[PDB]
Design a protein around this ligand. Structure first.
Ligand code: DAD
Ligand code: MG
Ligand code: MG
Ligand code: MG
Lengths: 105, 669
DNA sequence: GCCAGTGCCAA
DNA sequence: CTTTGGCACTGGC
């Protein structure tokens, strides 16, 4: 249910997907990243229809995050028509995420 | 005998004013101060002592006070002042001889807290005086509301300065007496503070005379400086910088950037358990924040990170990328870190062809940076040290090494890249007499380079004579010893043969020998027994050295050629101590005798004369010469002086030198 | 800016 | 157990 991005698939999968896309920049060695992970699996099917959940491991794909000024992880970027519409950094509980999404959708 | 010291407005290079001076006279036992307007009187007092056949003691006067007084006498009073070398004593030179096992701050040029071992108290005080004075000055200023500038404490004379001047002499006198109480260098039956100059030198250990002569001569060399081709180095720098950039571009293309944790202040604890996970990167839990276009959410933890670009000068980055490509380290350090030197890099193997080739780019990059650092960007770079006169005035501690060898710094002219190393031709060529134009004719000067032949192996011959009756001393003269060894060891170059034989002679293990010749430990064994069996007296000498020094120490010092005590650090490095010291003392008396003979022939030392010492690199001297004829005489004279030194100390092996004439160091060595 | 850890430049 | 030295460059506090 989740979209696993690569540096080379980012443009067409996110910047041109024209719709709501939540991107999560993460790394395996990050505690918080490991925390919000389970939350994202659930948000995925629950918003299946009004949103798309995509993940990009910054270690395997080192070229995308810098273009967005990543300063901490996990970084949550909600794109809309190829542009960032809202961002949040840190491991949010499922409750807070649902708020962020409903509020931005 | 008198003890003195002066205070002036700046370092020798730009000093223009005499602030004050103090003189303690042993015959009257009183201290006399000389303020700004007493400069003429101060000088008269010093010349008077010279007129009596007396002595003047300074602490570092050989390099500073004496030449500074000559300079200031001309500038301020238009007087000709030149204290004779035979009338001067230098407590710094003396302590460096007596306590050769200790380090010193080179008159505060070095950070004391950085030096290893202990420091002699009196000398420590002396070397720190300027820094202490500077502090008292700044303090007193802040107490009166004024702002402190650079080093204004030296711009004008003042009574605080005068008090420190007086304190220098009191401390210097105490240091002197302490040094003169060493029965080994100064016989107890003689009061050395109550005799004429000729007596002082003739009744003390030969070493006392040699060190003072070496210091006087080397101070002159520093003043001469080494003519430097600034333009050629600035162009070498441009060339190296472009190659560095291109290597960086290629490398940052092959080895991409990445992120790592940075800024974590909080500890990450498992949500369920709550146990600390100190291994996980430290995090941060924003206090304020909610769902508000702020990016953070109170209580929502994240890991602060930073983006890092590949740095070829980082052994860490290198190690990280190579392992990420399949590299499995074989050797680590006493800190867990894997060894990443050229020898290891040369042996690394990975699948990805591009990454494999990248290793060569990395080795080239490190080397390029090595040259840029020494020539232009480092704190001690040549381009940062060239003076207005177009010369680099490297500093020299005449007796800075425990063995009696000298040390070199600011910058270290005894570590210029060899002509056979990458970019060595250009580096070497930038140091040359040719870059100095005669003050009268405007014509370039010529360079004479002389180097002692197979120095330390001949010292081995000497000490092995009692065991082998001079066989080695004799066979070593049959053609070039290093070239002869190169052939027998089947080595690629003569340089490789030199580093091989000495490593061997000084205890290199089988593995180490293998490395040196570029092979394995087994090849190291072959060579080790091959040369050892070809000259068994080497073992005899080693055993004898051992039986004499070790019993726990039976005695922890060797007696040098001139009688001094030479501190031994390890039983295993004892032979090196014996031979390096002998070689160092031979070369020291050698450079002294060389100049003395040139002067006896009527030649004058100086740019406004006939020749000028530009550098002394252990067993090598590079001398600037006004003409080729003079260069020819310098070379011939240097050879005569060496034979003289060998005869002087009844050396059991004939001593030689090889000379070269040319425009620069690239050609003269 | 200070300092440990590494590693290279010379003899 | 090569030895004697100077010095640069990264990375941690
Ligand atoms: N790798 C080394 N290890 C230890 N000591 C060395 C080493 N290289 C040189 N030395 C010492 C011993 C010889 C002395 C002077 O060096 P130099 O290179 O002039 O040797 P050398 O005098 O034997 O050779 P040459 O006859 O070629 O001038 O410094
Ligand atoms: Mg002084
Ligand atoms: Mg030599
Ligand atoms: Mg030499």
């Amino acid at each position: 249910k989740i979209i696993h991005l690569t540096d080379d698939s980012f443009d067409t999968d996110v910047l041109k997907a024209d719709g709501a896309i939540l991107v999560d920049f993460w790394a395996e060695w990050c505690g918080p990243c490991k925390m919000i992970a389970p939350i994202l699996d659930e948000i995925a099917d629950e918003y299946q229809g009004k949103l798309t959940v995509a993940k990009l491991n910054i270690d395997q794909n080192p070229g995308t995050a810098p273009k967005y000024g990543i300063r901490g992880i996990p970084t949550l970027l909600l794109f809309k028509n190829g542009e960032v519409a809202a961002t949040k950094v840190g491991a949010l509980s499922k409750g807070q995420l649902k708020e962020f999404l409903d509020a931005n959708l | 005998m008198i003890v003195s010291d002066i205070e002036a407005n700046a370092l020798l290079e730009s000093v223009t004013k005499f602030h004050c001076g103090v003189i303690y006279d042993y015959s009257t036992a009183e201290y006399v101060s000389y303020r700004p307007s007493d400069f003429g009187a101060y000088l008269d007092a010093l010349e008077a002592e010279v007129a009596r056949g007396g002595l003047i003691v300074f602490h570092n006067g050989h390099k500073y006070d004496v030449p500074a007084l000559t300079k200031l006498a001309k500038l301020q009073l238009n007087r000709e002042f030149h204290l004779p070398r035979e009338n001067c004593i230098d407590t710094l030179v003396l302590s460096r001889l007596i306590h050769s096992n200790l380090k010193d701050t080179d008159m505060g040029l070095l950070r004391s807290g950085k030096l290893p071992g202990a420091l002699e108290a009196w000398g420590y005080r002396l070397g720190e005086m300027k820094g202490e004075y500077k502090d008292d000055f700044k303090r007193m200023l802040e107490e009166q509301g004024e702002e402190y500038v650079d080093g204004m404490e030296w711009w004008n004379f003042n009574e605080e300065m005068m008090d420190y001047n007086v304190q220098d002499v009191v401390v210097t006198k105490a240091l002197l007496e302490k040094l003169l109480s060493d029965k080994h260098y100064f016989p107890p039956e003689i009061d050395f503070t109550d005799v004429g100059y000729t007596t002082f030198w003739s009744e003390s250990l030969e070493a006392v005379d040699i060190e003072h002569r070496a210091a006087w001569l080397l101070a002159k060399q520093e003043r001469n400086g080494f003519p430097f081709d600034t333009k050629a180095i600035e162009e070498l720098y441009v060339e190296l910088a472009a190659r560095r950039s291109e290597l960086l571009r290629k490398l940052t293309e092959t080895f991409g950037s990445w992120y790592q944790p940075k800024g974590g202040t909080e500890m990450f604890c498992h949500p369920r358990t709550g146990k600390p996970l100190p291994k996980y990167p430290r995090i941060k839990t924003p206090k304020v924040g909610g769902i508000d276009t702020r990016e953070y959410v109170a209580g929502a933890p994240y890991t602060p990170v930073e983006h890092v670009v590949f740095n070829p000068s980082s052994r860490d980055h290198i190690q990280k990328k190579l392992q990420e490509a399949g590299w499995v380290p074989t050797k680590y350090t006493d800190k867990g870190a894997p060894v990443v030197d050229d020898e290891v890099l040369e042996g690394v193997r990975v699948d990805d062809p591009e990454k494999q080739a990248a290793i060569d780019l990395i080795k080239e990059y490190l080397m390029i940076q090595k040259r840029i650092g020494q020539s232009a960007e480092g704190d001690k770079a040549w381009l940062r040290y060239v003076a207005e006169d177009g010369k680099i005035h490297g500093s020299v501690n005449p007796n800075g090494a425990v063995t009696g060898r000298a040390t070199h710094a600011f910058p270290n002219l005894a570590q210029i890249p060899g002509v056979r190393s990458p970019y060595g031709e250009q580096c070497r060529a930038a140091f040359g007499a040719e870059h100095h134009l005669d003050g009268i004719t405007g014509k370039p000067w010529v360079q004479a380079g002389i180097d002692a032949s197979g120095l330390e192996l001949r010292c081995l011959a000497h000490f092995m004579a009692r065991f082998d009756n001079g066989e080695y001393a004799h066979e070593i003269l049959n053609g070039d010893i290093h070239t002869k060894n190169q052939i027998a060891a089947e080595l690629p170059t003569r340089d490789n043969a030199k580093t091989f034989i000495y490593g061997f002679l000084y205890g290199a293990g089988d593995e180490k020998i293998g490395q040196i010749v570029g092979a394995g430990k087994e090849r190291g064994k072959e060579l080790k027994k091959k040369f050892l069996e070809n000259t068994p007296a080497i073992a005899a000498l080693r055993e004898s050295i051992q039986q004499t020094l070790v019993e726990k120490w039976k005695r922890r010092w060797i007696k040098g050629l001139d009688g001094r005590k030479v501190h031994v650090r390890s039983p295993h490095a004892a032979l090196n101590t014996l031979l390096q010291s002998a070689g160092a003392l031979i070369c020291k008396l050698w450079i002294i005798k060389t100049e003395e003979m040139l002067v006896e022939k009527g030649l004058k030392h100086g740019w406004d004369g006939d020749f000028a010492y530009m550098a002394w690199v252990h067993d090598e001297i590079q001398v600037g010469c006004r003409t080729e004829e003079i260069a020819q005489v310098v070379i011939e004279t240097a050879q005569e002086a060496m034979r003289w030194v060998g005869d002087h100390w009844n050396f059991r092996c004939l001593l030689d030198t090889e000379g070269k004439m040319g425009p620069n160091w690239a050609i003269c060595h």
